[PDB]
């Protein structure tokens, strides 16, 4: 995690990709920054109005 604690191997990928993380491969730490959607305009009736407009 970006705070520095490890993430256990039973954590799902969909919970992992909601924030940044660090990936250690041998000794190099790559700071992975996934493309995340907003969480301010993520009121669920607005996100459903986005799914309705797109479909």
């Amino acid at each position: 995690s970006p705070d520095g604690v490890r993430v256990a191997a039973s954590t799902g990928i969909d919970l992992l990709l909601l924030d940044d993380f660090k990936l250690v491969i041998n000794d190099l730490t790559y700071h992975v920054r996934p493309p995340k959607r907003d969480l301010l305009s993520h009121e669920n009736a607005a996100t459903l109005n986005d799914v309705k407009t797109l479909v």
Binding site: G4, V5, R6, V7, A8, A9, S10, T11, L15
Partner: protein
């Protein structure tokens, strides 16, 4: 260091300190589908120096 249980996205996240590297590790628990012994099995899978686990 303490053991902290917080809630993220409706799931409990428990942050416990592993002995062999002395760094914390957060476990995401599922309150209906999971049991105690599968949490202890994940806790022994994350670090092999946790031969003795118990919960009281």
């Amino acid at each position: 260091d303490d053991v902290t249980v917080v809630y993220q996205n409706g799931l409990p996240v428990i942050s416990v300190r592993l002995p062999s590297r002395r760094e914390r590790c957060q476990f995401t628990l599922k309150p209906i589908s999971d049991s105690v012994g599968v949490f202890l099995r994940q806790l022994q899978e994350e670090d092999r120096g946790i031969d003795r686990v118990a919960i009281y």
